[PDB]
Amino acid sequence: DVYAQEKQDFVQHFSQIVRVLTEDEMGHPEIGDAIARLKEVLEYNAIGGKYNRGLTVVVAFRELVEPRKQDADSLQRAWTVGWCVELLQAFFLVADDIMDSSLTRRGQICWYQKPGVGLDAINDANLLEACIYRLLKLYCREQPYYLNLIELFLQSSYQTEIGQTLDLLTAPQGNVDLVRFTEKRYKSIVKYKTAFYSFYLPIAAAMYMAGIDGEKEHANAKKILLEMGEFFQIQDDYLDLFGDPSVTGKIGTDIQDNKCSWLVVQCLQRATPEQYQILKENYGQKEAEKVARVKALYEELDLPAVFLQYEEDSYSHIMALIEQYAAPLPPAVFLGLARKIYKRRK
Amino acid sequence: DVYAQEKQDFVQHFSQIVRVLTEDEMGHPEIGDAIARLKEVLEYNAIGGKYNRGLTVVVAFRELVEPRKQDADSLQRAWTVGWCVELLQAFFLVADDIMDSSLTRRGQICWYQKPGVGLDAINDANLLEACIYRLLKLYCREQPYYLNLIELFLQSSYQTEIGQTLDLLTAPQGNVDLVRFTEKRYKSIVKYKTAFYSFYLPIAAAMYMAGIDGEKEHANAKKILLEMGEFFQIQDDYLDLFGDPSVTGKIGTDIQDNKCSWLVVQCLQRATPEQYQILKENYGQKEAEKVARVKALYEELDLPAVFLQYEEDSYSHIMALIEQYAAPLPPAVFLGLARKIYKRRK
Numbered sequence A, B: 001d002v003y004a005q006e007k008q009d010f011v012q013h014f015s016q017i018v019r020v021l022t023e024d025e026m027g028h029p030e031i032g033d034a035i036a037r038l039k040e041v042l043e044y045n046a047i048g049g050k051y052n053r054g055l056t057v058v059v060a061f062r063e064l065v066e067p068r069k070q071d072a073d074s075l076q077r078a079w080t081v082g083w084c085v086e087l088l089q090a091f092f093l094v095a096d097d098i099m100d101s102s103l104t105r106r107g108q109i110c111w112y113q114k115p116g117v118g119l120d121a122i123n124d125a126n127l128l129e130a131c132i133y134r135l136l137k138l139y140c141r142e143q144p145y146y147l148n149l150i151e152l153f154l155q156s157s158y159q160t161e162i163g164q165t166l167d168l169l170t171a172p173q174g175n176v177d178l179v180r181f182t183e184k185r186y187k188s189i190v191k192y193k194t195a196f197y198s199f200y201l202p203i204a205a206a207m208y209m210a211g212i213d214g215e216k217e218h219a220n221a222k223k224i225l226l227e228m229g230e231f232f233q234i235q236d237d238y239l240d241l242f243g244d245p246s247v248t249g250k251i252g253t254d255i256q257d258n259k260c261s262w263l264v265v266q267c268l269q270r271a272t273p274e275q276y277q278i279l280k281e282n283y284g285q286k287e288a289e290k291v292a293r294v295k296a297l298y299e300e301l302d303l304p305a306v307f308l309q310y311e312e313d314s315y316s317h318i319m320a321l322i323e324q325y326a327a328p329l330p331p332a333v334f335l336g337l338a339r340k341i342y343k344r345r346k
Ligand SMILES: CC(C)Oc1ccc(-c2ccnc(NC(P(=O)(O)O)P(=O)(O)O)c2)cc1
Pocket: A091, A092, A093, A095, A096, A100, A160, A161, A164, A193, A194, A236, A240, B122, B123, B126, B127
């Protein structure tokens, strides 16, 4: 409801974002062709998702800043900072799809698979990252939370890249890594790779924008939000295989890519010696036949039912965490986000 | 001489850099394996160059800060900031070698060509970038120039990535781009892709560290330094083909990659209609035979002699710029850098 309410305005602001980031073509003609490519990169990769991470910024901001302090310029800054989180996401996904050998994303071919793009997408991705800091400078430089936002985005990217490193190291191509696929390992990966940037970052940015900069307040928000991020990644892992691809807009690659997915960790905890062997012989390989055999094993082990039970226990746990740690922030900040991620099939 | 003098100390400080960036393994064991990979990435990609960009920071700092203000902590910060420029370089080269399909760098196989690395190097490269901002926080956060250094590194990366975009767009694989290879275009590419980060950034960082933050002073330094950066790129383009690879430590790919190199711009300005055709039929293609034919054309046109003449006229021009714009900074700041780049064969 609160997201549905704010969405249209958020998405509409994308035009101004594009306009301001391409406005340097005015004073420096010689970079015109690069700025044109930047616009095509933004249009292809920053649009077409759910905008949940960027919208969380705007939602939280409206709920945290006194309505009398929500003037036109203030709101424009909030939408800009929400867009910064979306640009960070677009940076990450462009590179990650290369790294994971993905085919589609958000209902279309991955940018790097477009003819004439290929590994040039590495540079495109990094330009998306650079745009975040240009927009923070253009819109927030004079604000008392400016440095806080800069350090928050830089720290989030570092933590996410630390997570991505654990993800890749635990998933080598061409090698059997079953021994490494543990619950403990899984939780560490997802905490770093997903939970910081997708959950703590947008809420913390709005906190800083509302002048809520206390260490204890940030640590209490973080306790709820990192646990929500872990659930979100487990659902992402479940959807990689069992999701509907016309809902998800992306084809799954976890089994082929030898990933430490929640599914494979659950499978391992439950496999007989013989099913372990089936997993061993079939996991982390490109053959469609071997990917099919893994999926058939998961289904044989009722993994979808185990996920649906996990979704329920996790929801309760997160709601207990909100009862404990939300104060003095409005619980609505966290509940609107929980509503948006739970029983979700995209 | 001044670089030779400062080098050993600079290189020795790399250990502390490594130590401090791996010190998070202490309090958070779960990221141990990522931190180990980060160390291997730093050791492979941040070592083995000339360290000129990082050393320029330390050299300029010593020449710009009153010797009475050069205490142990102050110097450690200068060496750390010099290392930040080297980490930025290592970030760029790792990604660029992927993008350019390079084979070797700094006398060894490119990191992404190592078995078991491949496109995981995209993430490695970005972690190198993240390390810059961790080191600025750990060492300079309490300093009045902290924000200035952050914005300078972020702005330099943006400008460099804008340059890289022009470079890629002007060099499409599989297509003839002769018409685009102009002097005007060339100068724009190199100004953005090379000159900002390799010349303006290290001197400007030391300026900010010395409390020299004036707009006019920065703009006067920049006039000298961007012209030096353009010469440096033209020499890099000449060395891609005519350099000795046991000096340069890298194999050239410009002709195969269809690059808007200074060599091809010079060739075009001088080619007969028939030599234009030779260039047209042979440029931007993987065949060793076609690369050989391009080189034979350049040699037929005395391009090495044209470069040696350009090196001399450019040196004079740069020295005229130093006579005009160095004040009130010591001309030694700029001359030590010119000495280090001119008549250079690495
Ligand atoms: C610099 C760049 C390489 O760093 C990163 C790029 C992407 C990511 C990242 C984090 C969390 N989720 C994703 N994508 C998901 P998705 O591919 O959308 O299902 P995952 O591959 O982990 O299953 C990517 C993290 C870091």
